[PDB]
Design a binder for this molecule. Structure first.
Ligand SMILES: Fc1ccc(-c2nnc(-c3ccccc3)[nH]2)cc1
Ligand SMILES: Fc1ccc(-c2nnc(-c3ccccc3)[nH]2)cc1
Lengths: 194, 194
């Protein structure tokens, strides 16, 4: 039943590892899932819809992992607290590089993909700001920039910097250095008086 | 003579204000520059080449403005020093929003545009790191992250955050708040012991 849909998804993720969505065909996806072309069209209207579904899965996985941290606080210093959160996104997206690449590209051409990315970014920024606010409220973080504005910039930084690193863009921070790089910038900017 | 090339450029920049490159035609550009379609093809092989030229102009303008600061140090505190540099990019790209938008999009489809952006980013990151290094050398900045890695993340942050703001993306920092936002993050991360 659904194992056909899952097979399509798995085929798409696999094929995106070695070439872009544009060089992958509905036939390739059907062939890989062991189904005919019209059978494919029963499960998805377009290969673009397959990518959207893949991206939605990756985004919700990151989001659910963050929810679990949010409910299950690690007993440890503030630097470690931020590192563990940023790590959700490093591990989640980092474990799904092809979907991440492809989904980034699709923001330009798909309003669904753009809106999906926008929705979750608002969620993550809002949660970031709520934590900064918690920290300010307990006297651990100084009342410097508007928390929501600082949160936005830090989240956008992580988006661009993680994705450049995963892709090995020139320039990019080495993948093995990017977590520490981001954590330093978050901690200094959140706790820094100057 | 060249005023025909300049006219083409000016027409392209104008038309990009209200629609994307894809919805602008060689005819539109020729019409706007007051020349025929084949005359256009004497000055540029493609409308894509026109955009590349426009982007190259904007990028070199930012770069030359930074060179001038680099040679002409403002007498003022370290926070102001970083603010004045970041401002080169806020004013330059901010004064050319359409070219900035369009050129960002063209990185996906043009290896020339991608390589142009890559080249200048390496330059700006290298200059950032050289300044951080200067600051460390004089005992003003602590020896924390590798300077080149910190520089990369801060430059990528500015790329993504400025461009989201100029475009009014959801989410984005308000354009009237983005300079202060970026300067805070640069200063705290560069000078912060913790
Ligand atoms: F409480 C937290 C901690 C980290 C983060 C975070 N770390 N990285 C990101 C991010 C957001 C979008 C794309 C990639 C990474 N977001 C959000 C909330
Ligand atoms: F010494 C400095 C100071 C600021 C900067 C800088 N500020 N903003 C950027 C940037 C880089 C790429 C795209 C947009 C902004 N770069 C570079 C070197």
């Amino acid at each position: 039943g659904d194992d056909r849909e899952l097979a399509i998804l798995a085929t798409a993720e696999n094929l995106l590892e070695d070439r872009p969505l544009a060089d992958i065909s509905v036939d390739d996806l059907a062939k890989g899932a062991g189904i005919s072309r019209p059978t494919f069209y029963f499960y998805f209207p377009s290969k673009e819809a397959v990518l959207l579904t893949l991206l939605d899965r990756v985004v919700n996985q990151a989001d659910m992992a963050l929810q679990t941290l949010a409910e299950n606080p690690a007993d440890t210093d503030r630097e470690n607290m931020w590192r563990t959160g940023i790590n959700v996104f490093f591990e989640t997206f980092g474990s799904h590089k092809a979907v991440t690449r492809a989904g980034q590209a699709a923001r330009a051409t798909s309003v669904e993909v753009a809106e999906l990315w926008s929705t979750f970014m608002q969620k993550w920024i809002a949660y970031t700001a709520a934590v900064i606010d918690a920290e300010r409220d307990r006297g651990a973080a100084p009342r410097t920039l508007p928390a929501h504005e600082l949160a936005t910039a830090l989240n956008l930084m992580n988006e661009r910097t993680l994705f450049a690193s995963f892709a090995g863009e020139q320039p990019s921070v080495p993948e093995a250095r990017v977590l520490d790089t981001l954590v330093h910038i978050w901690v200094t900017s959140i706790y820094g008086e100057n």
